[PDB]
C-alpha cells in the first residue's frame, strides 16, 4: 500500500545487517 525498503540491522528477519523491504 505505502512501500518502503530500509537498510537495517537485527531486522526482517535476520541476525545480521542488510537491506530490508516491503
Amino acid at each position: 500500500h505505502f512501500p518502503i525498503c530500509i537498510f537495517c540491522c537485527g531486522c526482517c528477519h535476520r541476525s545480521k545487517c542488510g537491506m530490508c523491504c516491503k
Epitope: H1, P3, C9, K16, C17, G18
Partner: antibody, heavy 122, light 111 residues
Framework: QVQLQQSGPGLVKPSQTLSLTCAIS??????????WNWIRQSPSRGLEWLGR?????????DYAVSVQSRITINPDTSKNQFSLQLNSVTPEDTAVYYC????????????WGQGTTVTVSS | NFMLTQPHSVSESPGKTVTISCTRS????????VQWYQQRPGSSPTTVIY?????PSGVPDRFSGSIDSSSNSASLTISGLKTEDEADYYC?????????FGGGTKLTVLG
Amino acid sequence: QVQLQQSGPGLVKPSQTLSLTCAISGDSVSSNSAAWNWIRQSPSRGLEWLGRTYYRSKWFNDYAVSVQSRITINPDTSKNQFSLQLNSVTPEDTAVYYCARGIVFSYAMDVWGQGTTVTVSS
Amino acid sequence: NFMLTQPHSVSESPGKTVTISCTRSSGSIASYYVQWYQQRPGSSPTTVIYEDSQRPSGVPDRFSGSIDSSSNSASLTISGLKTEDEADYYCQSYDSSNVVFGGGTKLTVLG
C-alpha cells in the same frame, strides 16, 4: 532456468553514453524475490558492482557512489529486460559488464549473465 | 570505505583440503553477509557460497563458507580438490554505503 542475454555496442567513444540491455527469461524483472544488478570487471580495477533495480510495490534502485552521478538502470516490464547507461564515458570505463540476478537483502548475486566487453577508445 | 583482502594465489594437491581467506579492513565481518564467486578463465563468474555459508543449487558440498568474527575474516574451504575447482575466487560483501569485492585468489590444483 534463468537466462540473461546481454546486448549493446562494444565500442564507445570518450564523452559518449555506454548503453547495454539485459533480457531476462525464465524469471520476472518484477519478481518479488529478486534484484537485477550490473557488475563490471577489468584487470586492475577487478570486480565492481554498479547498481541494481527491483520491484517491491514500487521500483527501487541502489547504485555505487563512484558512478551514481552518470549511471541509469531502468526496468522494462513490457520486454522483461533491464538496461544500463553510463554517461560521459572515459577510457577508465573499458571493462567487461555483467548483468546478474541477486538477493535484495544481502547484496548477493544469484545468476550471472555472460558479459559484454565494452571498450572506450576514440 | 573498507576493503576485502585475499591472498593473490593459493595452490594445493588434488584430494586435499584448501582454504582461501578474506580479511575485512574495517567494519565487522559478522554484521554483513559474505558471498563467494568462482570464475574460470574466459567465463563469467558463478556464485558458490551466499549469505556466509548458503550453498546455491548445483554447487558440490565440497564447497563451504565460514566466518571468523575474531580475525574479521570470511573463508572459503574446498575439500577433496579436483582439477575442475581451479579458478579465481572472489569474496564480496557490503556495508551501508558500498558493495565491495575482494581482489580475487587464483586457486591452482597442482598437476
